[PDB]
Amino acid sequence: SVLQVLHIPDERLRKVAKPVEEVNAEIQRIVDDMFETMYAEEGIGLAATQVDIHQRIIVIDVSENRDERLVLINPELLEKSGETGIEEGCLSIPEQRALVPRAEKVKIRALDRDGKPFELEADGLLAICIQHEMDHLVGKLFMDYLS
Ligand SMILES: [Zn+2]
């Protein structure tokens, strides 16, 4: 399915991520669909959030530990190791290029898509790629980040 957030005929009108405290309905698709993406993407670059107001449950499936198709967040964070940026130039008109993001490994004090607060580290090319997504937007280095 992939997370089909919208832009330009949308209302983002410059969207950032609006941290994770609670859950709604769409949230499932952020997890469930970031699985469909985090796994079927790692190529073009989406921008993890942007239709109207936001939240951010991230994902992982048997990725760091001997877990299941679990989740990671962008929450109320605790640790933030290294920085990198991806060579994209994404969202709200994904033209131009840049390395907006700046993350390597990042640990959270978050919440999943149940409404249950979870503290975990998010690592790997995807943690950096889905945050990429929203590090294109909330990690903002770029310029206009074509928003
Ligand atoms: Zn990108």
Swiss-Prot record:
It comes from the Bacteria. It catalyses: N-terminal N-formyl-L-methionyl-[peptide] + H2O = N-terminal L-methionyl-[peptide] + formate. Inhibited by 1,10-phenanthroline. Upon overproduction is isolated with 1 Fe(2+) ion per monomer, a Ni(2+)-bound form is as active while a Zn(2+)-bound form is inactive. Keywords: Hydrolase, Iron, Metal-binding, Protein biosynthesis, Zinc. The active site is at residue 133. Coiled coil: none annotated. Monomer. PANTHER family: PEPTIDE DEFORMYLASE. HAMAP family: Pep_deformylase. Removes the formyl group from the N-terminal Met of newly synthesized proteins. Requires at least a dipeptide for an efficient rate of reaction. N-terminal L-methionine is a prerequisite for activity but the enzyme has broad specificity at other positions. Belongs to the polypeptide deformylase family. This is Peptide deformylase. It comes from Escherichia coli (strain K12). The gene is def.
